[PDB]
Design an enzyme around this catalytic site. Structure first.
Site, PDB file in Angstrom:
ATOM      1  N   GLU A   1     -63.114 -72.044  71.675  1.00  0.00           N
ATOM      2  CA  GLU A   1     -63.738 -72.722  70.547  1.00  0.00           C
ATOM      3  C   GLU A   1     -63.897 -71.918  69.270  1.00  0.00           C
ATOM      4  O   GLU A   1     -64.030 -72.486  68.189  1.00  0.00           O
ATOM      5  CB  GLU A   1     -65.074 -73.283  70.964  1.00  0.00           C
ATOM      6  CG  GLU A   1     -64.931 -74.472  71.860  1.00  0.00           C
ATOM      7  CD  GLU A   1     -66.251 -75.138  72.074  1.00  0.00           C
ATOM      8  OE1 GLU A   1     -67.008 -75.245  71.065  1.00  0.00           O
ATOM      9  OE2 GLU A   1     -66.523 -75.544  73.236  1.00  0.00           O
TER      10      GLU A   1
ATOM     11  N   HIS B   1     -74.685 -62.500  84.956  1.00  0.00           N
ATOM     12  CA  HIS B   1     -74.416 -61.710  86.141  1.00  0.00           C
ATOM     13  C   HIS B   1     -73.330 -60.679  85.970  1.00  0.00           C
ATOM     14  O   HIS B   1     -73.465 -59.541  86.417  1.00  0.00           O
ATOM     15  CB  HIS B   1     -74.051 -62.608  87.313  1.00  0.00           C
ATOM     16  CG  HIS B   1     -73.864 -61.861  88.595  1.00  0.00           C
ATOM     17  ND1 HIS B   1     -72.756 -61.075  88.843  1.00  0.00           N
ATOM     18  CD2 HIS B   1     -74.656 -61.754  89.689  1.00  0.00           C
ATOM     19  CE1 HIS B   1     -72.874 -60.519  90.036  1.00  0.00           C
ATOM     20  NE2 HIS B   1     -74.018 -60.913  90.572  1.00  0.00           N
TER      21      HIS B   1
ATOM     22  N   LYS C   1     -79.665 -53.253  88.661  1.00  0.00           N
ATOM     23  CA  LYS C   1     -78.861 -53.608  87.488  1.00  0.00           C
ATOM     24  C   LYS C   1     -79.584 -53.192  86.212  1.00  0.00           C
ATOM     25  O   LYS C   1     -78.976 -53.021  85.158  1.00  0.00           O
ATOM     26  CB  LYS C   1     -78.589 -55.114  87.467  1.00  0.00           C
ATOM     27  CG  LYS C   1     -77.693 -55.599  88.594  1.00  0.00           C
ATOM     28  CD  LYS C   1     -77.596 -57.101  88.571  1.00  0.00           C
ATOM     29  CE  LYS C   1     -76.629 -57.594  89.604  1.00  0.00           C
ATOM     30  NZ  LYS C   1     -76.683 -59.065  89.675  1.00  0.00           N
TER      31      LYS C   1
END
Ligand SMILES: NC(=O)c1ccc[n+]([C@@H]2O[C@H](COP(=O)([O-])OP(=O)(O)OC[C@H]3O[C@@H](n4cnc5c(N)ncnc54)[C@H](O)[C@@H]3O)[C@@H](O)[C@H]2O)c1
Ligand SMILES: NC(=O)c1ccc[n+]([C@@H]2O[C@H](COP(=O)([O-])OP(=O)(O)OC[C@H]3O[C@@H](n4cnc5c(N)ncnc54)[C@H](O)[C@@H]3O)[C@@H](O)[C@H]2O)c1
Ligand SMILES: NC(=O)c1ccc[n+]([C@@H]2O[C@H](COP(=O)([O-])OP(=O)(O)OC[C@H]3O[C@@H](n4cnc5c(N)ncnc54)[C@H](O)[C@@H]3O)[C@@H](O)[C@H]2O)c1
Ligand SMILES: NC(=O)c1ccc[n+]([C@@H]2O[C@H](COP(=O)([O-])OP(=O)(O)OC[C@H]3O[C@@H](n4cnc5c(N)ncnc54)[C@H](O)[C@@H]3O)[C@@H](O)[C@H]2O)c1
Ligand SMILES: NCCCCCCCNC(N)N
Ligand SMILES: NCCCCCCCNC(N)N
Ligand SMILES: NCCCCCCCNC(N)N
Ligand SMILES: NCCCCCCCNC(N)N
Lengths: 337, 321, 337, 321
Positions: free
Chosen positions: B95, B246, B287
């Site tokens: 896009e 993620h 993380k």
């Protein structure tokens, strides 16, 4: 014009009638009742015999799946595999009640890992610091021990050695779906969704298969034994032809993200799915694809204009087992007949 | 210990002052103020001395944000090398390019998909995209794909999403394009499932007139993971959830957690989704470093992000030049 | 047909232009831009002079509020008073930019209490056990010390003694709005929303005023000095005539619950409000009133069919200060002129 | 330590078994299982020996749930004296009565309010209510109000919401009415802002043809607070948020917390709303005893509640008779 009336427990706890009552209870209870009818419509149509003209058309695919009067796409976000919905999904696949599976990385790997070690219940509030110090990973209000992934590593690595070889020596051209079929064959456990999937020739698609522990393993392994390649182009063709050559199609989509868009977009290739049922928690105000109403998909041509899609705003862990109980599980015989 | 106090409009209207008051207004207003501090901490660290930086910033956004005006906001950061790695889904890539060939319009959420389809208009939230937009996209894309296949066969190019994204940006060759700037500044873009959107459609069709194209997602994983592994410091700014979130966080896990993290999404946790997971859950996986002070703002990024940027990156444009 | 274009920071940080840019950014950014225009439309109309025919009609109320070409209703849930939005609201009331206030119990009492002791910032994760052990109450990610309410008690009780007396000896017939006016007079602090409210003759409605610390105090006090009565019937009449006799009406509703329905329902008495802007986090799937879209209110006749209502799905703590900055605060002079 | 495992439909379909599996399915499925245990713990305690009970149960629901079929589910519990105090907003009171004069229909959320209004139809979610419903309501209500005013002046009745609710239930005199049963079993109903809905409209209009009516909300506060204060044990089952939730919990604060608490609402906490507050926040105020193990199920009660009741109260109908 039906009137709003909830189940009257003065009739006693008649579970079958209680669930039927949801449709006239309102709000999401009603959407559930509608979801049940829509899923049954898919089932009814799928169990229809394949006339000569439709059988001919449906037979225009290389796949070994017995063409059905209606191809059903089942999609679910990874976390739903982490949850007990894994069993609910394993069932449908086990008995060939769905034709194509679409799930993200997590949704694939965690199914296998549950065959080597279980996931535990926990709490959403458990702090990430203490958890990490005890080698525990948090997935919602569920818990996964680091050891789970170690085991996963031992099991996987050699298979990856096989795949890299088979790639270079036997010229295999790996893709997510192909690897997923392989892993399920390898897991060889009847509690595994993917074991059944490959056994029953039900393709599983996961464009970003590298987004998970399976991706971790592939990454590491790629260093001691480099070369592995996963093409996502072949799989696109694969999943698109599944929708293109279908007599009818049904979409059952749990959750959102890639799983949702990938399935619907494939149905756009045939200019719309015939039936569609969504069970996700997403809302539309953020302009997300996840939260878009089924009517938005109608504008693109992913859901036929004449279809009567349904969306149940709720956690699938609660709704799905119920939906299944009142639809597929009720036609258990037909799917074995 | 800070007291709750909102902006006193009796001072008149000083926008910089008003934005500062958020910090002590509470609820999400506060989280915004916290987010501003974190984004600045990343910036400060990145600007430290002794092309790698004292801090590698990962920017992630869901496709729809590229459909929105946030395309401009992101184009800016990429344009001036204020971020290091970009992670966005298929829609988020295609896009941006299409917007260089035709615009996306405003609309409403209530518009019915039947009439819309009958008029060759697609709906993206309260936005509208004409079918002709994609026809133009096809015209533009097809020939580039031909070369890509050619180069793959005759020149041994092993295409992957990031590589294709660099190519297409170079190709769109328009300053209004995020990806045009990305490749110019050598800012890698990762999209594991690039085949999930019109670009996939095009790749699909084109594969029948000119078969062969292969997009490997294994190389890209190594690529994005090494980006996090060999970094001095790392900051994560993730708008939205899904793969984008993620993927970026999982890459930081390879370095044992990110140093800074700011999330702006509308997801909630009760569904047990990765999207709706609080930053503290990512800490359990490793993380986000245990000592880090992550921040999540529960809000639509179309509102928050331009503001966040105004009070952080935009305030240091001189340092970045 | 406007095109989607976000603010281009290559123009530098021009705050005024940045906010104007939201309208063409999409999703909720656009709704905000629309909200700004709708609120300005109310303001523009309110600042219109009152012709003879309209002035006559608007003058048909006993109230001492200078009739305006447009009566603006401002509603907010209690928590927004706990937050810094208290200052944003205090401002509008201070300068008579709104005509009627509607807020729940918390929304009234916490405004006063902030005049005796501050509310602190905290975290959403703080555990309720340790907090309680330290005499700290949690309100979102805010913190309120028990002492805050003790002070509140010392200040309030005697006033309640006055009110009970004034009730029995001077025959006053207390209602929420009347008590709220009284308390604001009593708090006598310019940082207080309600102090200003009564000073500027801006009525405050809160049907369930007993649902809070103020209710606690009334309950206790009722034992050492029984008798107090709060009639909610009079206040209904009061708030309904405010809508009935208005030339025009605007609704600005932050949050949902009673505050939202009470204001809109009052506007139904005049067969719809002329302008309406909502800023709440509620969604509609649960069939709640809070989450209903402004279009649902159109079916009942709470919002004129020809109106162009707007809803911004977001936390008001973020949006409101901004909305105000671009609307009312911009007409600061006019409201003092 | 319990393992995650969902129902194995290979056993065929045993509804009782399937509902039991929720507990270990996870996410909200689990919370449901937890809710079932808590509701039963209340029940067990209430059924203990040595008209007050070994445990006072407060049932609260938002108006819209009375618009829905959950009206039946609640009518049942009240009908068999399985709960002690009812707390619901104005809509929740009036619509139960109206349903005895005319039904509410199913519809859709997308129906436009313009056309709906032109056809004399009001929308409540995906439900529909014809204007004639309220006309009938007026016919029925008006004369009762006349008596109420009369009795207030000539007989010294000091009306309050609970008292009026008891009266109207007695008056509707229909077994399908929640409030009809409530007054029969001496189960008090509290609604501080009873004037916020059609009943308020009616009271409004009627006050011009026959002025005078007064509804005191002070007496009712004392009433509901004493209900919690003098209770052996207390359990809170709160469907929805808003006044209903806070009112019930605030009353339990007078007894230093409730013994059991189960919430079923769709609210989230990020907005800092009381509705979206987790049960743990109520613990800080002392509305839920520190030692209690509250449970919140993030879901639409139209789905969860009938199920919760099927596995709790409905399982003990003999004990309650
Ligand atoms: N299970 C895991 O948490 C996990 C584990 C490993 C890797 N991953 C990785 O994370 C990536 C992102 O995950 P995803 O896109 O599959 O899902 P997600 O967690 O991003 O969820 C996407 C949307 O689905 C909806 N949803 C999620 N859970 C739901 C539920 N219980 N009921 C109803 N709707 C629900 C929500 O609206 C959510 O916004 C995956 O691509 C995967 O590679 C997931
Ligand atoms: N823009 C489009 O709608 C579009 C277009 C073409 C293709 N796609 C495809 O759809 C797939 C799924 O999309 P996705 O994973 O990028 O995102 P998504 O739309 O699935 O959203 C995931 C989550 O991110 C959050 N989110 C989204 N918009 C947000 C916003 N404005 N503010 C705050 N948080 C927000 C929400 O919690 C949402 O549940 C993509 O992988 C892509 O291939 C998207
Ligand atoms: N401040 C407090 O938390 C508090 C304190 C004391 C007493 N109370 C009592 O609690 C009762 C219930 O509170 P209420 O009805 O005022 O509100 P609420 O907390 O019940 O919220 C109602 C709805 O308003 C919306 N909302 C809330 N906060 C929002 C925000 N920041 N931005 C946008 N939308 C938001 C949400 O959709 C929510 O469901 C009150 O009647 C009052 O008596 C409140
Ligand atoms: N039923 C009606 O819509 C209606 C009708 C007439 C009058 N009213 C008036 O509207 C006022 C505001 O209504 P309210 O405070 O009772 O509720 P509400 O509609 O304001 O909802 C408050 C919160 O409860 C939760 N909730 C609502 N429906 C739910 C569901 N089905 N499942 C789970 N949680 C749910 C949501 O988080 C919501 O934000 C009432 O005080 C009343 O006087 C309501
Ligand atoms: N090849 C068709 C792709 C259609 C993409 C539609 C995207 C919709 N996105 C949101 N609703 N956010
Ligand atoms: N390589 C590590 C991946 C960890 C994935 C964890 C996913 C958590 N998901 C939730 N829904 N919380
Ligand atoms: N006197 C008019 C009252 C209108 C009440 C409308 C209630 C709508 N409720 C939901 N949308 N839940
Ligand atoms: N009488 C004590 C009342 C306590 C009210 C606390 C309200 C908490 N509100 C949130 N939004 N958390």
């Amino acid at each position: 014009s039906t009137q709003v009336r909830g189940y009257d427990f003065n009739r006693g706890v008649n579970y079958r009638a209680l669930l039927e009552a949801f449709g006239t209870t309102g709000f999401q209870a009603t959407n559930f009742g509608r979801a049940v009818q829509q899923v049954n419509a898919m089932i009814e149509k799928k169990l229809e015999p394949l006339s000569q003209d439709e059988d001919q058309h449906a037979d225009l695919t290389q796949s070994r799946r017995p063409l059905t009067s209606c191809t059903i796409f089942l999609g679910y976000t990874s976390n739903l595999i982490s949850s007990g919905i894994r069993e609910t999904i394993r069932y449908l696949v086990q008995h060939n009640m769905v034709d194509v599976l679409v799930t993200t990385a997590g949704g694939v790997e965690e199914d296998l890992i549950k065959c080597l070690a279980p996931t535990y219940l926990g709490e959403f509030s458990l702090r990430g610091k203490e958890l990490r110090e005890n080698g525990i990973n948090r997935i919602g209000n569920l818990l996964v021990p680091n050891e789970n992934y170690c085991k996963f590593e031992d099991w996987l690595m050699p298979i990856l050695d096989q795949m890299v070889m088979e790639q270079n020596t036997e010229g295999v051209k790996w893709t997510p779906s192909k690897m997923i079929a392989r892993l399920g064959k390898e897991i060889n456990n009847p509690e595994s969704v993917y074991y059944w999937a490959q056994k029953n020739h039900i393709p599983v698609f996961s464009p970003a298969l590298t987004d998970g522990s399976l991706g971790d393993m592939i990454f590491f392994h790629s260093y001691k034994n480099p070369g592995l390649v996963l093409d996502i182009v072949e799989d696109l063709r694969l999943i698109n032809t599944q929708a293109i050559f279908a007599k009818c199609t049904g979409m059952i989509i749990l959750g959102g993200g890639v799983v949702k868009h990938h399935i619907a977009n494939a149905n756009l290739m045939r200019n719309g799915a015939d039936y569609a049922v969504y069970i996700n928690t997403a809302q539309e105000f953020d302009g997300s694809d996840s939260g878009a109403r089924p009517d938005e998909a109608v504008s693109w041509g992913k859901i036929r204009v004449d279809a009567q899609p349904v969306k149940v705003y709720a956690d699938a862990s609660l709704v799905f087992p119920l939906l299944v109980a009142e639809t597929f599980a009720q036609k258990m015989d037909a799917f074995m007949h």
